């Protein structure tokens, strides 16, 4: 089981690792675009791009499975120790608001890229059928080239030191002390 990722997404993931661990910069969670509309736009674009041979059923199945798996996987293999405090205070705010928060509404596509990066480890550690594994791999490559077709409007390099929006914010001294300390 082998999976390929285009070098732009690998560079984006490496830059994200640099931002979190080295630059001490977490992602801007109150962002304009989240995972749910990412998958909705991807599904709409691939549905309106090609014909209708019966693949929309498995397309919606893949979208729903990715949404549910990102919902129940966000606190398992994603979420660096720096961003754990942000997740904790968002969960505390949602607990005070009497509402059940799901990660597809607030989290950006960088965590989805992290999930696709760690996907081969998850497939290799689980007993799965061969044909379903190849179908999941093919849908993964389709989503990867769809993200490669829209890098500029979705992953734009911006610095949080001088702009209101950069899909990334700087961590404070208190935030770093709580997260990377105790």
């Amino acid at each position: 089981i082998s999976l390929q990722i285009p070098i732009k997404l690998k560079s984006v993931l490496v830059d994200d690792w640099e931002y979190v661990t080295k630059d001490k910069k977490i992602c801007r969670l109150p962002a304009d675009v989240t995972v749910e509309m990412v998958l909705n736009k991807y599904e709409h674009e691939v549905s309106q791009e090609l014909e209708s041979p019966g693949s929309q059923s498995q397309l919606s199945e893949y979208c729903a499975g990715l949404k549910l798996y990102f919902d129940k996987c966000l606190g398992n293999m994603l979420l660096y120790r720096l961003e754990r405090l942000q997740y904790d205070e968002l969960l505390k705010k949602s607990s005070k608001d009497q509402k059940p928060l799901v990660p597809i509404r607030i989290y950006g596509a960088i965590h989805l890229l992290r999930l696709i990066s760690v996907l081969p480890e998850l497939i290799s550690s689980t007993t799965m059928d061969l044909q379903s594994c190849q179908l999941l791999i093919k849908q993964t490559e389709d989503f990867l080239v769809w993200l490669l077709m829209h890098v500029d409007e979705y992953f734009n390099d911006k610095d949080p030191n001088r702009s209101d929006d950069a899909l990334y914010v700087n961590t404070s001294s208190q935030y770093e002390g709580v997260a990377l300390g105790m």
């Binding site: 990715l66 120790r81 997260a179």
Partner: protein, 318 residues
Amino acid sequence: KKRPKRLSSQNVNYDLKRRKIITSEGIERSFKNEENEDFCSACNQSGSFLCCDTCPKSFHFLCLDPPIDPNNLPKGDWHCNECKFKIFINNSMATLKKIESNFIKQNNNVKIFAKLLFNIDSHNPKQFQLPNYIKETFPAVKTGSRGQYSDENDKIPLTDRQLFNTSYGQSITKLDSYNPDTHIDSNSGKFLICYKCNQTRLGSWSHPENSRLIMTCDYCQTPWHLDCVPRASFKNLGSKWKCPLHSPTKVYKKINYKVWKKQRLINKKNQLYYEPLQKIGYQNNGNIQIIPDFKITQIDENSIKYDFFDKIYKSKMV
């Protein structure tokens, strides 16, 4: 003729050490008789640790799926996720025969992700860690001690020999004492000539104040004086000392703005693809190299001079 034997008194001993004065002489009669681990294998860091009674794995207060705060920690026994999966339900009673297929049969045919959803419960929470095949396409980066990003920009940590017991004069600093060895390189034994002023400025032992501090660049080994570039002391801890003559990682062109955080290099496998075709008006936005997907070109001095003259000959009218 120091005397810490008889003049060290009896009531008070060596400071920073209590004695028996607060225990033996403390009578007040005025009341008139009325398995665990210590490495945190979810983020590979240190801090306040919580452990399970029957599981050797220990976690952090925030590395837990539902991050718990020390001010309202749960009472009684605490268990991990696979502790709830192995010692508790779905393994001791209701043994796993076909409940995994029942997950597909119940969760509305999500079979391409239902197995991963079921394996989520049989998986401890942990921080994000970059996969091995993601790391291998960038040879310039590496994993640190606790698992932080470490490219060639960051210097290696200094050892304890060079930092604590590095004698007195040295003291891991050349600002103190005459240090002529910093001006001589061991590769050829010649003199390190600074870029701005073409003097090594070693000076003399009779006049130590005439000596000027110099440092070696960490990339091209270019000597540089401490007074030419604005800088107070050396650079030993932190990132590698990058002289202000190379390509910066991030530049700003206000017009909102563009960052261009470089391309951080690709290894010598098939991903590195070369295609030198055009020398004038390529608009390749940098990431070039000099010779005598991520697209790069074999540019030379002539093409760079040509496009530079073209751009400043179009831009001098404005």
